[PDB]
Structure formats: structure tokens, C-alpha cells
Amino acid sequence: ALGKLQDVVNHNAQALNTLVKQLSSKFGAISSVLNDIFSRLDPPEAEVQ
Amino acid sequence: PTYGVGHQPYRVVVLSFELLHAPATVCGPKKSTNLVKNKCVNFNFNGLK
Known about the structure:
part of a larger assembly; 2 chains; 49 residues; mainly alpha; 3 helices; viral protein
């Protein structure tokens, strides 16, 4: 019965969850954690990564 | 012993470092300070800046 409200609630929740999970992606980089990139590679390469 | 520089024998050693989530065994010569638990502090627990 209350489907039209749960619809938008679940849509917003899924949008937020996907926006959070997108942080785990690397986008071709070596790691998703930026602190690891800062601590391992030199700044000239850390900026590019 | 009488050859060009482009054909002289070499001796290469490759070092592989595993960054997987595991208890660290090989570390750096850096020391270790005390530990506080009630304030914003920068931790360096062998894998995290």
C-alpha cells in the first residue's frame, strides 16, 4: 500500500550507498586509499596517481 | 672479458614487496612512541597514515 513512499526512500538510500561504495573504486590507480599513495610514491608520481 | 658495454654480463636482484592485509614482519628502522586514546592523533600502525 505504502509503495510510493518506500520507493523514493529506497532510491535515496541506494543512491547514498552507491556514492559511498564508489570510494572503493580505484579508477585505474594503484589503490583507493590516498594515504597509501602519499606514503609509498614520491610526490611527482603521487600527484599523477 | 673483451666485449662491448652492451653485452657485458650483469647481476640483477629483484625485490618483491607484498602489500596484502597481513601481520607485518619486515618493517622500517623507525622507533615507536607511546599511545593515547582520548584525542585526535595521527596513527602509523604499519599500514595507515
